[PDB]
Amino acid sequence: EVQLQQSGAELVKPGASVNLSCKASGYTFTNYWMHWVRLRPGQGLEWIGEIDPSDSYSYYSQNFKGKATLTVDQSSNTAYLQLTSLTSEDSAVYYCARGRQTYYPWFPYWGQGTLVTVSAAKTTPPSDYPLAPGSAAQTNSMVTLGCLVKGYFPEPVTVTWNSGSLSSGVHTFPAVLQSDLYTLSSSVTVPSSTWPSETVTCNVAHPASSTKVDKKIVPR
Amino acid sequence: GVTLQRNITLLNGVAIIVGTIIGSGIFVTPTGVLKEAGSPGLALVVWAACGVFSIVGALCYAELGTTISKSGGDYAYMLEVYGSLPAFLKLWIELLIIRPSSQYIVALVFATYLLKPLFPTCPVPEEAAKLVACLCVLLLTAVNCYSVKAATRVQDAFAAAKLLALALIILLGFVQIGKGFEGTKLDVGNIVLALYSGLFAYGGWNYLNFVTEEMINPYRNLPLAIIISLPIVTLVYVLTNLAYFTTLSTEQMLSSEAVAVDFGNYHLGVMSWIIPVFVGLSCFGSVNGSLFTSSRLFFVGSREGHLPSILSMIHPQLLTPVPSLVFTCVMTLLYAFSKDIFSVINFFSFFNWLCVALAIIGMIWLRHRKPELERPIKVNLALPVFFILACLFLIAVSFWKTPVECGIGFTIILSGLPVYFFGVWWKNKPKWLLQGIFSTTVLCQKLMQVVPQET
Amino acid sequence: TGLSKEELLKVAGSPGWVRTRWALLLLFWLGWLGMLAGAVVIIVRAPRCRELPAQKWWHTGALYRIGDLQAFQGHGAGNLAGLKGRLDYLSSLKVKGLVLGPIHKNQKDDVAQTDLLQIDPNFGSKEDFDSLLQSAKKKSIRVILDLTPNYRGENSWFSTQVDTVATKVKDALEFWLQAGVDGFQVRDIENLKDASSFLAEWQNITKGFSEDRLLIAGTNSSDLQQILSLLESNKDLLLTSSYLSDSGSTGEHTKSLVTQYLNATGNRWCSWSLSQARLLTSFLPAQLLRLYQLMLFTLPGTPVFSYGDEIGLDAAALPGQPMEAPVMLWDESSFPDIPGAVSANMTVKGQSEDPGSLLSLFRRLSDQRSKERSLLHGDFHAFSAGPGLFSYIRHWDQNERFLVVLNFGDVGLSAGLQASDLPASASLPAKADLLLSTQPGREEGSPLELERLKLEPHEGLLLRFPYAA
Amino acid sequence: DIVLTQSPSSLAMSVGQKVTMNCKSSQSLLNNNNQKNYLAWYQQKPGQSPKLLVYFTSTRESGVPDRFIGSGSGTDFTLTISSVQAEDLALYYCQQHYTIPPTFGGGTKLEIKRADAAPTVSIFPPSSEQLTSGGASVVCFLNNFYPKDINVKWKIDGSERQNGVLNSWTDQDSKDSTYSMSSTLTLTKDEYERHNSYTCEATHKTSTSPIVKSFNR
Ligand SMILES: Nc1cc(COc2c(Cl)cc(C[C@H](N)C(=O)O)cc2Cl)c2oc(-c3ccccc3)nc2c1
Ligand SMILES: *[C@@H]1O[C@H](CO)[C@@H](O)[C@H](O)[C@H]1NC(C)=O
Ligand SMILES: *[C@@H]1O[C@H](CO)[C@@H](O)[C@H](O)[C@H]1NC(C)=O
Ligand SMILES: *[C@@H]1O[C@H](CO)[C@@H](O)[C@H](O)[C@H]1NC(C)=O
Ligand SMILES: *[C@@H]1O[C@H](CO)[C@@H](O)[C@H](O)[C@H]1NC(C)=O
């Protein structure tokens, strides 16, 4: 195993700094340099810079020089990217990446991205509302169930059904942003034998305000 | 009553010429001739060659200054031939650029080399070097206000220091022989730049002419002070070059930025500092000779009406041209502001030789036009024509070395035309100028107690 | 005009103006004396120069070893009077030295038939040797002679009775100094028992003759500790070694091999070399030859090349010849045993013409290291300039400062230098003058923006910049 | 810096077929000294990190299926997939590694073509808990169709609704290559009270007539 991992989500009020953080595992941390890359939506990847854990030297693209600041902590295998003066157009996903050879830039191992949103609008935990078919529900052999997620913030909310057990036949629709709050919905389809007979829950989860909620889909 | 009296005896006339020829040049310029000659043999030949060329030129000025006894020297000889405007265009460049830059440059060489043994391995502090240049220029324009006998006793002293330093250099050279031609850049295009880079070290031989009018006996002593000096200089130069080649290898002279100091380090050890100090005191002599001579050029320029009348005035109890001196000092110190300086002189590489060529062309035309004018010296016409022909070639070489910079110089010469038309052709007609000119003039006369000279 | 004589005198007389003239006299002299005190103040309250450390000839630039006079020349001409012909080349390389690989009468593995004093007559006569040596003095190339005893054999000190062999050397050094050589090379000191003691004796013999003679030891070793032990007791010994040889073969270790060794020795004098005998091209792959020549000429210490390093000679390129002694390629004739195998660009003649050639880089660097006070004996400060880069500044008290930037890794940089943590005395400028690059297509002489510079893979730069008070 | 143009920006292709990405660099990425070409291809599936496919133009990473073949030299480079699987829909980026900092292409969106299929349409009356809020949201799900183009009519007691309607499509499902879409209508409680019959009807190119679902509160 080699595995980098990162915090899920960060909200930044415009102009403030943020720390994005990346813990390595599965290798001798000082042997390999750590790179930070970014992905602006609809605009392609961009590389920030890299840091050497053996002496804290770091090298940065011309676009980030002085705007970024990498450091490192050898005691925990953690690398930290500080970013500063963040504007709305610096909202992005920030990825921590490891090289193959000692510093050369091609990236076999990436951490799952930290989604950085830059907005003055406040953190807002989600409101979850289950959906059940109502009239003529059991007249068909397969039945669909749903979970509206409304008025939440920031962007990353996750849905899994029955604690990830119903990983087959789930559709979760991308979020819609309205009046500076997000709306999303998730859906699953099960045998008509299952739904009235068994537990069904959308296990909605929100990294940026720590709320975890398991609404049961109960008939009308 | 009041005039510039005839103070300059023959040996002081030899001081004014040897003091301003020997310069800084021989102690730092050998490198320039080896760069274009390659070979100690070809080098030591072009040193002799531009020596005899310089003697031939000086013999034309030894003629001219007995035919025309005015102290305008190189300027007067143009005025008496080409008339008002050509003479002014010279005096403007001399006033604005050549004399104050020259005076400053050589003072800064005085400052740096006199300080150098406190700072052997590194730069002498620049804010100290510019003060010690300014203290020098200020002191010598004080001395040349106090008495021409003091001025010429100063240049006797420092002309002696210079030749003593070269004798010491030559002697150690022969001592090194007593203790027991090469690869030549034989292209004519190399040789000509060797010769043209060597002629700078003789530049100065015309300076006696600007003090013709203060010689005790000009018709004898002005040609004699030339012939008593330039052959002496030429000998001392070829012997001094010979001395360096006994001690510094060609590679070392091609790559040492103060040739005499390396020769000092090799021979004198703990006492090496003597040679830097002699290069310094050597340059002091050249500032004095230049300030002296230069004050007379502007004096004459004002007497002939080319230049504002205050500069003609003399101090009655000391008989020194105090407003011309004071002007010359101030115009020198105004070059102390400039972050670069040699460039402004390099713009006029051609100008010295051009004026010399025009003077001796003048001497040809003056022999055709007025054979009846008195001539205690009458040189065989071969020498003037040879010397002219040679200068017209060197003027072209001076351009061909850097065709941009001689163009910049030629552009600045035309700055003389605005000033000539405003200062001479316009007759200063507006009363708000004319009354202010007068008011300023009478203030200066009052302020330092000076009066016009009497014919 | 203005006032007449009489008119000016009568008005000037007024006590007010007489006092004004007296005031301004006094004022002027006061101002000049103020300036004199001021300039004396500046001269005293200003930083002094640092005394130049006394420099033996071997500080002043590169040595140059000739392990076999025959292989350097081609046969027949393979004698000392042949070498006397070549010194104009060497003088063009600006090599302040030579090392003639052993010329003494050695019979292979025979301790008794070998002598270190009589020369092996194949190479000429002592009358030739002196003729050379006097020419070399005349041309400013000091000459060292190599005294390693059994040089035609397997083990250079023989297997047996080593104290008799050391006794041969002890006598030899005296004779050859009296003959007028400037120093001695000895090799394979890992094959010498009690090595440190014999080096100490021979060093004492040499310095006891005169202060301007040296003993160059050499070892097959690449161990930092073994080398530091041979350099412990002997303090003005150059000791060439394999220590830089194990470079990682895309340079990657070198920033670290070099800065450990400087640190460990305490920045004494050193001799950089990739070996005691073999060519640079015995170790380096040929994209790094330029990059190493930039580095060997600009570290603190006396670099050392084997013959033909200056042209990137390689024993493998013309097959069959021994890796001990490859035939030097002067011109297209020089290896006639397989004619047509020599390309023009592989030869001295073929490089001498071409500003891009390896020998045009060697010649150029040799100049800088032998004239510029900063490379001649300045300090050295490494710093982290960039990912691959080994980068460092050479400097001396106020003279020109030289930043070297070697891109050892195979990936170009696209984002400038970006120096972390320079010494406060040695801070980088905003821009510096490119004095040369390892690569073509550069604006040599021009100032570069260090924050926006772009090195190619393997591009080294030599930047020159002026001092700051 | 170097710049990498990439094309086409979209590459819709059918399962089993061969496909080609082009990448085009503003300098050469052949290293003369070493005779290899510095480029890499990364696949980024929807909702995941980049995975490295090939580097130095051709060298497959371990754990990469051998249907990815990379090729080219100088400045014309191509990643090819010999026989596209349903699991391969992604954005693909080229990256140079001839200089650090590196730079990337704007990426090719691979899309899958399949036999067209009509949406499963379902409509969900407002959640009884939501009715506490003073608002209500009616939701219509359209599942497992192809191609992406679709439209929805909301009818409320027969009146057509065009204010306060929102839509979201999924990215195309890697198991079956179908799209799905959610449509949402948000009402005040009193706006949900005053009207009785709610209809979602969907027009998709597989049927002349719209598909319909509805409920009466
Ligand atoms: N037209 C013109 C005329 C003169 C006056 O004539 C010369 C004198 Cl007065 C002295 C020297 C140098 C002297 N021979 C020495 O040894 O330093 C050369 C010339 Cl051309 C100039 O001087 C200089 C000069 C003098 C000292 C340092 C640097 C430059 N530039 C000149 C340009
Ligand atoms: C070696 O030389 C040093 C002086 O450089 C001296 O102190 C020492 O006694 C000498 N030893 C021998 C044995 O010559
Ligand atoms: C160096 O010499 C030692 C001792 O003979 C030997 O063991 C070692 O292998 C040698 N190494 C090289 C690189 O010649
Ligand atoms: C080597 O360099 C380090 C740099 O921090 C220094 O602390 C150390 O004293 C030096 N010397 C040795 C022998 O490690
Ligand atoms: C020299 O020229 C040859 C022939 O064109 C070429 O193959 C080679 O790469 C060049 N370089 C060297 C060092 O041989």
Author numbering:
A (entry chain H): 1 to 220
B (entry chain B): 43 to 222, 233 to 507
C (entry chain A): 162 to 630
D (entry chain L): 1 to 217
Paper text:
The Fab fragment from clone 170 (Fab170) was found to bind to CD98hc, similar to a previously characterized antibody MEM-10823, and was used for subsequent studies. The cryo-EM map shows a well-resolved density for JPH203, which adopts a U-shaped conformer and is stuck between the hash and the bundle domains. Unexpectedly, the 5-amino-2-phenylbenzoxazol side group is not accommodated in the previously proposed “distal pocket” surrounded by TM6 and TM10, but instead faces TM3 in an opposite direction and is partially exposed to the extracellular solvent. This interaction, in turn, expands the hydrophobic space and prevents the rotation of Phe400 into the substrate-binding pocket, thereby arresting LAT1 in an outward-facing state.
LAT1 (SLC7A5) transports large neutral amino acids and plays pivotal roles in cancer proliferation, immune response and drug delivery. Among them, the L-type amino acid transporter 1 (LAT1; SLC7A5) is notable for its broad substrate specificity, transporting not only essential neutral amino acids such as ʟ-Leu and ʟ-Phe, but also the basic amino acid ʟ-His, non-essential neutral amino acids ʟ-Cys and ʟ-Tyr, bulkier derivatives such as thyroid hormones (e.g., T4 and T3), and amino acid mustards such as melphalan. In this study, by combining the lipid nanodisc system and cryo-EM, we have resolved the structures of LAT1 bound to different compounds in three major conformations, outward-facing, occluded and inward-facing, delineating the transport cycle and the structural changes associated with inhibition.
